[PDB]
Amino acid sequence: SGFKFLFFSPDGTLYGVHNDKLYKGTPPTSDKDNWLARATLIGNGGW
Amino acid sequence: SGFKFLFFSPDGTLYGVHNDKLYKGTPPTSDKDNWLARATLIGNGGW
Amino acid sequence: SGFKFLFFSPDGTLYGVHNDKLYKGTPPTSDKDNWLARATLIGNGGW
Amino acid sequence: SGFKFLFFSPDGTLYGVHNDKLYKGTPPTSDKDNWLARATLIGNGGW
Amino acid sequence: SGFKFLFFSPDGTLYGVHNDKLYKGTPPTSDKDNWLARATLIGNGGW
Ligand SMILES: CC(=O)N[C@@H]1[C@@H](O)[C@H](O)[C@@H](CO)O[C@@H]1O
Ligand SMILES: CC(=O)N[C@@H]1[C@@H](O)[C@H](O)[C@@H](CO)O[C@@H]1O
Ligand SMILES: CC(=O)N[C@@H]1[C@@H](O)[C@H](O)[C@@H](CO)O[C@@H]1O
Ligand SMILES: CC(=O)N[C@@H]1[C@@H](O)[C@H](O)[C@@H](CO)O[C@@H]1O
Ligand SMILES: CC(=O)N[C@@H]1[C@@H](O)[C@H](O)[C@@H](CO)O[C@@H]1O
């Protein structure tokens, strides 16, 4: 629970480290947007 | 109180994590501008 | 003490959170620049 | 273990500090991508 | 003692806070680049 890092790439993609995993995707648009469920998993550990 | 993350997207929108929630909005232009009151809630928790 | 956050906006302005307040201004060019005295107070608390 | 800093350059390259060393490279695109194995070492300590 | 902050400006300059001092410079190109030996000191304390 909670992100360790949460930051943008210069194209506007949101990146986040959550439970040692790395995710990316376009940023959420509302509190109805389950961002983590639709984010792409781009790293399985070590972050 | 207190933000856990406070950062910019490349289009100039300010993003912030406050009390596990995610907020965005144009940055304040003066200390009369209550940013958190006018920011768009874009995540209800898990941040 | 020091800063809680210190980060750039995409237009090149340096932002900083210091003693719960939000500051912005052009980045310092030498150690003779008192950036905190020089920056614009854009938020009086809650940061 | 884990990263101490993880952030983007405006040229699109991902930078990270891991165990006091500095690395850069294209961001990972999947959890098969061993980013730290293929990243360019650009700093052997002090970070 | 490492860096407290390490981040880019949108023109590609790397900024870092180290022992409460603020440094800037082009990012290191390889592990043979002593960045902090050649970085510009732009803040002597308070960071
Ligand atoms: C910090 C880092 O590069 N972690 C990666 C991880 O994301 C990836 O899923 C795994 C693939 O084997 O390799 C590494 O552990
Ligand atoms: C980290 C993350 O994606 N959190 C979101 C939250 O912001 C959103 O309000 C909720 C919708 O049900 O889904 C997830 O919990
Ligand atoms: C986090 C946040 O938006 N803080 C603001 C503060 O910056 C501003 O000076 C004040 C104006 O009334 O309102 C809020 O407290
Ligand atoms: C913080 C910093 O500038 N560290 C560098 C290190 O990355 C580099 O590999 C070394 C070369 O001798 O010099 C310095 O220690
Ligand atoms: C956070 C900040 O602005 N620190 C500066 C420091 O960089 C500068 O060298 C000194 C010179 O007067 O003034 C301030 O203390």
Side-chain angles (χ1 to χ4, degrees):
Chain A
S1 182
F3 284 70
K4 169 166 172 232
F5 296 114
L6 186 65
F7 57 101
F8 275 102
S9 71
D11 65 9
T13 303
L14 183 62
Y15 282 69
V17 168
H18 166 81
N19 296 342
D20 314 313
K21 282 158 289 253
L22 185 62
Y23 301 87
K24 75 171 189 193
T26 53
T29 61
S30 68
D31 61 343
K32 177 166 82 133
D33 195 357
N34 185 339
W35 182 82
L36 196 54
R38 67 168 174 84
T40 303
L41 176 67
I42 56 169
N44 74 11
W47 301 95
Chain B
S1 48
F3 285 90
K4 156 182 181 203
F5 296 111
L6 189 71
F7 56 106
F8 273 100
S9 68
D11 66 352
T13 302
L14 180 63
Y15 282 66
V17 171
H18 170 84
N19 287 347
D20 306 327
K21 316 206 154 233
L22 189 58
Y23 299 87
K24 69 168 181 186
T26 62
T29 44
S30 76
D31 57 0
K32 296 191 280 253
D33 187 353
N34 183 344
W35 183 88
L36 191 51
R38 67 164 171 91
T40 303
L41 186 83
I42 60 179
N44 255 336
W47 300 95
Chain C
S1 167
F3 289 80
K4 177 157 110 171
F5 299 112
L6 190 70
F7 58 105
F8 277 99
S9 81
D11 74 359
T13 306
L14 179 63
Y15 285 62
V17 171
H18 182 272
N19 294 9
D20 298 294
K21 289 168 315 156
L22 190 59
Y23 295 89
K24 72 151 173 193
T26 67
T29 68
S30 70
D31 68 4
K32 282 230 307 153
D33 282 353
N34 188 333
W35 185 85
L36 242 193
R38 164 160 111 62
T40 299
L41 189 49
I42 57 171
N44 253 286
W47 302 93
Chain D
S1 179
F3 281 64
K4 177 159 100 123
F5 297 103
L6 189 68
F7 56 111
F8 274 101
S9 170
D11 72 14
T13 300
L14 180 65
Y15 282 67
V17 172
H18 167 80
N19 301 168
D20 311 314
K21 306 180 159 80
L22 188 67
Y23 300 86
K24 76 171 159 177
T26 57
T29 56
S30 86
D31 69 343
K32 291 276 332 202
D33 186 343
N34 192 336
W35 187 81
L36 193 59
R38 64 162 180 98
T40 303
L41 181 55
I42 52 172
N44 65 19
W47 299 94
Chain E
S1 340
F3 285 78
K4 178 168 48 210
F5 297 105
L6 189 69
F7 55 105
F8 280 104
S9 71
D11 67 15
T13 304
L14 183 61
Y15 284 68
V17 173
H18 164 81
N19 302 331
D20 309 324
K21 293 182 210 81
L22 185 64
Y23 298 81
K24 79 171 178 181
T26 59
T29 48
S30 85
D31 55 299
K32 274 70 172 73
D33 198 347
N34 194 328
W35 186 80
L36 184 62
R38 64 151 176 109
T40 305
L41 174 70
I42 57 172
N44 194 175
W47 301 92

